[PDB]
Amino acid sequence: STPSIVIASAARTAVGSFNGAFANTPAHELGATVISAVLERAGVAAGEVNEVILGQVLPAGEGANPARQAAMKAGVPQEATAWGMNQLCGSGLRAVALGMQQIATGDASIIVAGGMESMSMAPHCAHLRGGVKMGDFKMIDTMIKDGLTDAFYGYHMGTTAENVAKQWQLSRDEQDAFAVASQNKAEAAQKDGRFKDEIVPFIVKGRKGDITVDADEYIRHGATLDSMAKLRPAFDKEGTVTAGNASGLNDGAAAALLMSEAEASRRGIQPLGRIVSWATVGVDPKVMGTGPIPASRKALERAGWKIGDLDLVEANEAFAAQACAVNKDLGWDPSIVNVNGGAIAIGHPIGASGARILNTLLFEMKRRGARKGLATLCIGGGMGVAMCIESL
Amino acid sequence: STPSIVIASAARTAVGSFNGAFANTPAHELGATVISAVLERAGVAAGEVNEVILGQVLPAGEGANPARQAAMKAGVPQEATAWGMNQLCGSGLRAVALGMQQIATGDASIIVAGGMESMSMAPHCAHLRGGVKMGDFKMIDTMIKDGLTDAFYGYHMGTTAENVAKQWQLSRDEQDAFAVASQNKAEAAQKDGRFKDEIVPFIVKGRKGDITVDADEYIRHGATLDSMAKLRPAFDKEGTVTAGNASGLNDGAAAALLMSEAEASRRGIQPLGRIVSWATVGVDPKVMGTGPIPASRKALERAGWKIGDLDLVEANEAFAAQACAVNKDLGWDPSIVNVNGGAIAIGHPIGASGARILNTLLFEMKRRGARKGLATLCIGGGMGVAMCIESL
Amino acid sequence: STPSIVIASAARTAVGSFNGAFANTPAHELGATVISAVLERAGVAAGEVNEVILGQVLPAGEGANPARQAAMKAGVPQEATAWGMNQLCGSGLRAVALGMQQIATGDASIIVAGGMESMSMAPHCAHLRGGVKMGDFKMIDTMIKDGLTDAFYGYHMGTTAENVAKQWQLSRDEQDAFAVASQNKAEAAQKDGRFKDEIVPFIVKGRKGDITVDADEYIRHGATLDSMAKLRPAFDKEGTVTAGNASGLNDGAAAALLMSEAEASRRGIQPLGRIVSWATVGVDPKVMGTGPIPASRKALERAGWKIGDLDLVEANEAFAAQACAVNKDLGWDPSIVNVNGGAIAIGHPIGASGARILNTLLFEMKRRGARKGLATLCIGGGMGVAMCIESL
Amino acid sequence: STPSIVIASAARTAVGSFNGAFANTPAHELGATVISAVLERAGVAAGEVNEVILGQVLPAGEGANPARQAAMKAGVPQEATAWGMNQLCGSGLRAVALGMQQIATGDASIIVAGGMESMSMAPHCAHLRGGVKMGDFKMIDTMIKDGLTDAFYGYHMGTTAENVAKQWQLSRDEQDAFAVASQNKAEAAQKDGRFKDEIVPFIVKGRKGDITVDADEYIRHGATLDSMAKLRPAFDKEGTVTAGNASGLNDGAAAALLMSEAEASRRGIQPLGRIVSWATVGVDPKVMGTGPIPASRKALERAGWKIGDLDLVEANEAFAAQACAVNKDLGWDPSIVNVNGGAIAIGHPIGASGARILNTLLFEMKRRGARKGLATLCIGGGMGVAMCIESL
């Protein structure tokens, strides 16, 4: 016996548009509906939860330990514990791995892991203690500063996307075609109802009416090639990366309920998947979108799998440029990759995104009867993270 | 196989006073000194590090994933990984448990773990995207909001301290004595040089001069009972908890280099300790200070130890009120607890604290030849974390 | 010598709604349009103007001396002078009076005078020099603080409205019926093109298309009594003053070209009127709304006129409570007061209001053939101002 | 007869250094003390005051109509009226002319007029109603934005001071020599007790000790030429204007009690002087410092005086450059100009300054026995204000 951890249930909120559906909704409120959903979906009571682990990159101003606020809201008992973590864009997936490890070391039985992010609610800030004798000073967008910018060179992540576009010789036309495809695929999945199983509706509490949000709002309908082609390079004036072939700024939460394989068998739960391996690797910050390459490779080696053994893949679409370079290097069949669209369409709620794509993978593996899956993301500052899933 | 992880080496900066020695030093610069130090003290090169894991509660405005910043600054290679975590006051110790689990489950060989915090540099913020159509709005002190306030009932942690004072019938005099004793013990320890081993000096790079910081500046010298007795209660106009019998606002970093016991041996390292067990449990938020009770018990049970087996103990002094209740309920010999003073004197740099007291425990264990230790902290929002360590 | 000052010409921008048509238009820009307008209307060249005087209450962040900025934009030469003034709500009419005095004392020949206000562009502010060691601080809405709040009692102007309402025993129903009557009057005048003459169109300079504003946007079309009677008290909680029976938050500018009666004859100008008298008087800030009573009476005594001699009156509608009280006490025929509706419908761009209503009176006095006219406003901090005008 | 308007009395606070003696004193508190002092020194009851006129450039956040606040706090009754005005740096001397005009037009019997300024209390601000969707923004220093920045070309007043220097060929050694001379003259005078009479003491209400400010604290004692020659230029990096030969940022208030000459004589009051003329003129903004030239020539033509005639002058030293050029062109004897020093030494409380120098002139005229006096100032944006005084 070697530990075997399973994913008993999963869920996500719709991914809200920047200052959209979740514009004034705290990340923990989203996370709390996702916690209640995994619990209800699994047939597990809040009472049984030992720990809640929630990847989250932008918690400034939300109060002490937003993960515990989420667990507490969801009725997870005070006797349980909770914590937040930050491996930037990888966070939501990394948390799942960290969850797995709690069970594997005998420290916990039942874990809810994933991530949550409200980019809309990220505040602007300034260090004012010393005090500003005289003159103007900057109020800093914490979302840009703490979530989207390279810490060591100063530039937007998009600049790394360009570095990757230049290196892999990825034309504007390749990048835009990829973008348009992500949209059209995500539209088709959405229209066919392929996101319903994974999405838990979220009730946005109002003064003048409650609003039920259960549709991914960032997905553009009838996206045209021309709409992409017309855009201006966003980061480099003779660049190639645009706001249309990059993912956006988004809100959401996503999580999974985990237990041992034998525990799921005792409870009669038909799990979404066995966690067969995971990995995280570093790369050059300058080309951070390449992260998935060494991370997926290492994850696969750990499972004893060939790239060609995979039946479905979710590789997060930070930028068309990096998603393209990843697909090229790995060489896996692109028809099995982000089959229901990706982040360019669906969005990128940073700390939740790793769990969001996991949710998409898992519910698509169930529906198509895919045996072996892999989810992976690039990570600002130069890292990768990947996870292998096998169906039971 | 039952993995066995050792702490090969450890270090910490001196603990800075609010807006004092480290007033404009970013937390990751503190962390980077400590990473370098654990490496040099262990005889391990930075190239050998697989992951850096740093608890940090107040990273707003520092830029993306300060743990990575710290790790890169210290010459940890881009191929390694790094991430931050947040379990409030527990974080710096939890990070060490979580680094242990990385090695236990075969994912890493070498981990640097602890925490870092610059409460000084924590900014003021506001959510300003929606705009403010009209009326006044708060610029919120992130330090207080995200670090020191109960997220549910809204009040300062001192209120939970009052709740513990009331419940355990802890007089003002008893709290003040406890406080004065922490000061006196820390001063003794400092003058005799007992912080020297644990502290790595930190160079505050100036303009008109580099200043080396290697002494704990929060410790007040010649602290009198009358100076404690004269203070007004800080949270409850007829309460008992004061600025003097509470910890302060502080800046620091602290860490442990971890590896398997078989690896230390290969390397010929004489480790500071073996991690025999850890535990984290929740309690009622209203009395979060009682955290250490169920976590310490669970940790000892896990280790197979009685309370009486312990030779040394570091229990973090957030508030004299809670430190007293912990010591009462546990009933361990108070002459073995915080033998070189605690956080009322030394300071409480939130995310670094758990690794700070682990540092103090390890180096005193080595000094005096103590076989069995325990580090534990209370955690805001109602938790506790604890770790058992055995000498080799 | 008996001087004799005439208003050669006059014009106002339309009145914009809070965060509306002029949401991003600086005051002096609205001001500059009005300055050139009175010049073009009078057939006097900008280079003939000796001085510009503009009432302005909320000039924070617009830069040095916005009166000099509006004058310069409007093509008044540098050899001239310009200044701003603040008698709060009465500033715009008071400036008109200050200009008359320049000519009377032989210090100037041609003056432009009035007021300008952008309540939209009023910032939030905080005193931040000392620095802020710890704790939240307030970001202060200068529109509320410097414009709508009584300095001596600390409450909103609407509270002084409650006071006057209680003093005069003005029912909610009476206050509301005034409010609907003012809206219906205004909506009638607008449709009928009675505001055309005085309104000079303003061009909102844009990126994605220029826009011409020439219609008062705050007037509610189809104002009903039932819609009024549904609202809640805005200030007091069993009060009588609502948002529907008080004036709004608005932007705009208004001015008048002044010169000696003889000067206008030299130039073939047919003046809108002769300034016969003016007067300002103080009252209790708690009932600041009563201000127009002593002021209007003083003004009438200086003119050597009786109340019944007036053919037309513009008495500013700060609050239906106060407007109703003033009218009740003076006993001037309601049918000659605010004939084209008042501020409850038109809005109340503070610094500009007083020239605003001067414009309305002057042009409607031209139109119907009225010979004697009176303008008056209540003033925050417990003042009144008034002016008497006679047709040539 | 003729409108003959006299200064019955005069008083001024000491001028404070920036963030110094009056660091947390609101302007209106400084103003109230000065209004009370003009009344006492004259022997006039506060209830006899008709209206109060206070220049003031930086009222952001002080609340509704600070001139009204000054007046009420000073004990002037609610019946009186009060308002502020901004002709920037001339505001405080222009206000005296405005009040004179109230009495000359027969609209008022007794006026208190001057200026007030807390440049230390001036806050930082931003326009945030619309909201800041994404990205960094500036919090703006209103002192700078609204007080010392030319709104047209964008630059600090010291650049226009540079423009006058290059134009007038005023060396670094020439301006330095004027600066030292203005400090010695001002220090000498202060030691002699020559500011005593004009100054009313102000009481800084403290918590741990009240403090009596009765000395100009911006004056620097033992001012040498070498410290002045060792300064780096502040505005132009290879320039000629420094912090040392330019005026400073300061706090203070100052005023004059006004009434007709016939009136003074009824009350048995020996006036400080009679206002014989005044004037205000525009100039090229770029070279704003030259304002005092055409304004004094004008003032003198309206008095029907020659420059020679003058027995004493107070020409405001905004900068050493603008000053020397105003001294050079007009050709008035330098010995009678700023005889007790100037604004370089004493300081420059923007909206109060004009009223400040009027005080020095009036009181020094009284002591030394000068019959004819002139005060004058340059004004940002390109204006001059000036006033001719005659002793009885």
Structure tokens at B283: 């309690």
Q: How many CA atoms lie within 13 A of C158 on its CB side?
A: 18
Are the C-beta atoms of residues D115 and D95 closer than 8 Å to each other?
A: yes
User: Which of C330, C372, C333, C364 lies closest to C346 in space, CA to CA?
Assistant: C364
Q: Which backbone phi and psi does D182 adopt, to 5 degrees? A: -75, -25
Task: Name the experimental technique.
Answer: X-ray
Cα separation, C181 vs C135, in Å, equals: 49
Rounded to whole angstroms, the Cα distance separating D35 from D15 reads 16
Phi, then psi, of C237 in degrees rounded to 5: -100, -25
Q: Is B65 on the interface with A (CB under 8 A)?
A: yes
* Chosen from D124, D127, D128, D138 to mutate, greatest number of chain B CBs within 10 A: D128
Q: For residue A122, what is the DSSP state? A: P
Q: Report how far residue A95's alpha carbon sits from residue A111's, in angstroms, rounded to the nearest whole number.
A: 10
Indicate the residue type of B381: G
Catalytic center residues of D: 89, 348, 378
Q: The tokens 């830069």 sit on which residue? A: C63
Please calculate the CA angle C86-C91-C93 and round it to the nearest 5 degrees.
Answer: 160
Catalogue the active-site residues of C: 89, 348, 378
Q: Please, is B215 exposed, middle or buried when counting C-beta atoms within 10 Å of its C-beta (0-12, 13-18, 19+)?
A: middle
Query: Which tokens in the block code for residue D20?
Result: 């110094």
Show which subunits contact B, needing at least 3 CB pairs below 8 angstroms: A, C, D
Q: How far apart are CA B89 and CA B169, in angstroms?
A: 25
What values do phi and psi take at B372, rounded to 5? -125, 125
Please give the distance of CA C357 from its chain centroid, rounded to a whole number: 6
Is D315 within 8 Å of D358 (Cβ atoms)? no
Identify the helix (H) or strand (E) that includes residue B282. strand B273-282
Tell me how far apart the alpha carbons of residues B39 and B35 are, in angstroms, rounded to a whole number. Answer: 6
What residues in B contact D129, CB-CB < 8 Å?
131-134
* Domain residue ranges in chain A: 4-124+194-275, 152-193+276-389
D74 close to D35: Cβ distance less than 8 angstroms: yes
**Which C residues, 201 through 220, put their C-beta within 8 Å of a C-beta on chain B?**
none
Pair D190, D216: CB distance under 8 Å: yes
Q: What are phi and psi of C272, to 5 degrees?
A: -65, -20
Joined together, the tokens standing for residue B8 give 């090969």
Which token pair is D201? 């003491």
Q: Where are the alpha helices (DSSP H) in B43-152?
A: 66-73, 91-104, 142-143
Confirm or reject contact between C257 and chain D (CB < 8 A): no
With contact defined as beta carbons under 8 Å apart, do D316 and D354 qualify? yes
For residue A337, the 8-state DSSP code is: B
- For the stretch A99-125, what's the b/e string if a residue is b when 16 or more beta carbons lie within 10 angstroms of its beta carbon? bbbbbbbebbebbbbbbbbbbbbbbbb
Contacts of C135 in chain B (CB under 8 A): 141, 144
Q: Is B135 in CB contact (< 8 Å) with chain D?
A: no
End-to-end CA distance of chain A: 17
Task: Return d(Cα A114, Cα A84) in angstroms, integer.
Answer: 10
Instruction: Using alpha carbons, select from C332, C373, C352, C356 the residue that is nearest to residue C54.
Output: C352
Q: How far apart are CA D92 and CA D73, in angstroms?
A: 20
Tell me how close the Cα of A249 comes to any Cα of chain C, in angstroms: 24
If you measure CA to CA, which chain C residue comes closest to D25? C127
Q: What b/e sequence results for B339-370 when a residue is b if at least 16 CB atoms lie within 10 Å of its CB, and e otherwise? A: bbbbbbbbbbbbbbbbbbbbbbbbbbbbeeeb
Catalytic residue IDs of B: 89, 348, 378
Q: Is B64 on the interface with D (CB under 8 A)?
A: no
Task: Provide the shortest C-alpha distance from residue A127 to chain C (in Å).
Answer: 9
CB proximity B130 to D under 8 Å: yes
Residue of chain B with shortest Cα separation from C123:
B134
Question: Which chains, if any, share at least 3 CB pairs under 8 A with chain D?
Answer: A, B, C
Q: What is the dihedral sign for C-alpha C153, C158, C159, C161?
A: positive
Q: Report the distance separating Cα B281 and Cα A82, nearest Å.
A: 10
CB C111 within 8 A of CB C66: no
C43: alpha, beta or left? (left if phi > 0; alpha if psi -120 to 50)? left
Shortest Cα distance, chain B CAs vs residue A184, angstroms: 30
Residue A255 three-state SS: strand
Closest to A253 (Cα-Cα) out of A66, A97, A117: A117
Question: Using the beta-carbon criterion (under 8 Å), do D107 and C98 form an inter-chain contact?
Answer: no
Alpha-carbon span A204 to A200, nearest angstrom: 13
Residue A40, token pair as written in the block: 């209800």
Query: Does residue D127 sit at the B interface (CB-CB below 8 Å)?
Result: no
CA–CA separation, D326 vs B159, rounded Å? Answer: 66
DSSP state at residue D391:
-
- For residues D262 and D140, give the distance between their C-alpha atoms in angstroms, rounded to a whole number: 49
Distance CA B38, CA B259 (A): 12
Q: How far is CA D289 from CA B252, D90, D94, D323, D379, in A?
A: 53, 12, 17, 7, 7
Distance from C-alpha of D222 to C-alpha of D215, rounded to nearest angstrom = 16
Closest CA to B352 of B15, B76, B100, B66: B15
Nearest CA among D318, D373, D308, D378 for reference residue D10: D373
**Helix locations, A146-215, DSSP H:** 157-168, 172-192
- For residue D238, the tally of other CB atoms under 10 A from its CB is 6
Q: Min CA distance, C138 vs chain A (Å)?
A: 13
Q: If DSSP codes are grouped into helix, strand and coil, which group holds residue C383?
A: strand
**Helices H, strands E: what count in chain A?**
12, 14
Distances in Å between the Cα of A23 and the Cα atoms of B127, B139, D153, D302, D374 are 11, 19, 40, 65, 63
User: Coil, strand, or helix at residue D254?
Assistant: strand
Task: Give a three-class secondary structure readout of B131-197.
Answer: CCCCCCEEEEEHHHHHHHECCCCCCEHHHHHHHHHHHHCCCHHHHHHHHHHHHHHHHHHHHHCCCCC
CA A242-A245-A250 angle, to 5 degrees, is 95
* Sign of the four-CA dihedral C343, C347, C350, C352: negative
The alpha carbon torsion through D177, D180, D186, D192 (nearest 10 deg) reads -110
Count residue pairs from C and D with Cβ separation < 8 A.
205
User: Under 8 Å CB-to-CB from A227, ≥6 apart: which residues?
Assistant: A180, A220, A244
Contacts of B137 in chain C (CB under 8 A): 124, 138-139, 141
Cα separation, A163 vs A153, whole angstroms: 13
The token pair at A80 is: 């349980």
Q: Which two tokens stand for residue A276?
A: 């067969």
For C382, phi then psi, to 5°, come to 90, 60
Task: Give backbone dihedrals phi and psi of A226, rounded to 5 degrees, phi first.
Answer: -60, -35
Q: Measured between alpha carbons, how far is A208 from C89 in angstroms, rounded to an integer?
A: 34
Q: How far apart are CA C388 and CA C302, in angstroms?
A: 9
- Rounded to whole angstroms, how far apart are CA atoms A344 and C290? 62
Q: Are D134 and A144 within 8 A, CB to CB?
A: yes
Contact C132 A128 (CB under 8 A): yes
Name all chains with 3 or more CB-CB pairs below 8 Å to chain A: B, C, D
Indicate the residue of A19, A135, A141 with minimum beta-carbon distance to D135.
A141
The answer to whether D299 and D374 have CB atoms below 8 angstroms apart is yes
Per the CB < 8 A criterion, the answer to whether A347 and A216 are in contact is: yes
B46 touches chain A (CB under 8 A): no
CA distance D66 to D77: 15
Instruction: Give the C-alpha separation, A341 to B313, whole Å.
Output: 54
At D178, the amino acid letter reads: F
Residue C212: its H or E element: strand C211-213
Smallest Cα distance from B137 to chain C, Å:
5
| Residue owning tokens 């007029």 | D113
* Closest CA relative to residue B323, chosen from B148, B181, B224: B181
List the one residue out of C118, C105, C125 whose CA is nearest residue C54: C118
Q: Helix %, strand %, coil % for chain A, to 5? A: 40, 25, 40
DSSP annotation of D169 reads: T
Q: Please, are residues C120 and C137 in contact by the beta-carbon 8 Å criterion?
A: no
- Does D301 lie at the interface with C, CB-CB under 8 angstroms? no
Q: Is A69 on the interface with B (CB under 8 A)?
A: yes
Residue D133 in contact with partner chain B when CB distance is under 8 A:
yes
Q: What share of chain B is helix, strand, coil (3-state, %, to 5)?
A: 40, 25, 40
Closest-CA distance of chain A to residue C146, Å: 22
User: Same topology for domains C4-124+194-275 and C152-193+276-389, yes or no?
Assistant: yes
Q: Using the beta-carbon criterion (under 8 Å), do C131 and A128 form an inter-chain contact?
A: yes
Token pair for A341 = 């669209």
What does DSSP say about strands D250-260 and D5-12: parallel, antiparallel, or unpaired? Answer: antiparallel
Say how far apart CA C349 and CA B326 lie, in whole Å: 63
CA distance A347 to A356: 10
Smallest Cα–Cα separation from A245: which of A309, A319, A174, A355? A319
Contact by Cβ (8 Å): D296, D69: no
Which CATH number is associated with domain D4-124+194-275? 3.40.47.10
CA distance A259 to A280: 22
Distances (CA, A) of A48 to A53, A76, A112, A258, B303: 15, 8, 11, 12, 24
Six token digits for residue A29: 């409120």
Please, what's the b/e burial string for A367-376 (b: 16 or more CB within 10 A of its CB; e: otherwise)?
Answer: eeebebbbbb
Strand partners, D313: D337, D374
Pinpoint the alpha helices (H) of A74-145: 91-104, 142-143
Spatial distance between the Cα atoms of C347 and C12, rounded to a whole number of angstroms: 13
Phi and psi torsions of A213, nearest 5°? -110, 120
For residue D375, list its beta bridge partners: D314, D387
Q: Which helix (H) or strand (E) holds C330?
A: helix C320-330
Residue by residue, DSSP assigns D292-357 as HHHHHHHHHHHHT--TTT-SEEEE--SBHHHHHHHHHHH---GGGBSBTB-HHHH---GGGHHHHH
Best mutation target among B50, B76, B78, B145 (most A Cβ atoms within 10 Å) is B78
CB within 8 Å of B238: residues ≥ 6 apart: none
Question: CA C350 to CA C143: how far, in whole Å?
Answer: 10
Of the candidates B156, B121, B119, B123, the one whose C-alpha atom is nearest the C-alpha of residue B141 is: B123
Name the token pair of A171: 């034309």
CB environment B106-139: b (16+ within 10 A), e (fewer): ebbebbbbbbbbbbbbbbbbbbbbeebebeebeb
Q: Do D144 and A137 touch (CB under 8 A)?
A: no
* Mutation target among C118, C120, C134 for the B interface, most CBs of B within 10 A: C134
**CA separation (Å) from D152 to A301, A361, C66, D60, D89?**
67, 59, 11, 21, 16
For domain D152-193+276-389, the question of CATH label 2.40.160.40 is answered with no
- D135 → chain A, closest CA residue: A141
DSSP helix/strand/coil, D264: helix
Token pair of C98 as six digits: 């200050």
Determine contact: B124 vs chain C, CB below 8 A: yes
Pairwise CA distance, residues A270 & C256, whole Å: 82
Q: Judge whether B144 is closer than 8 Å to chain C, CB to CB.
A: yes
- Quickly tell me which residue has 């013990």 as its tokens: B185
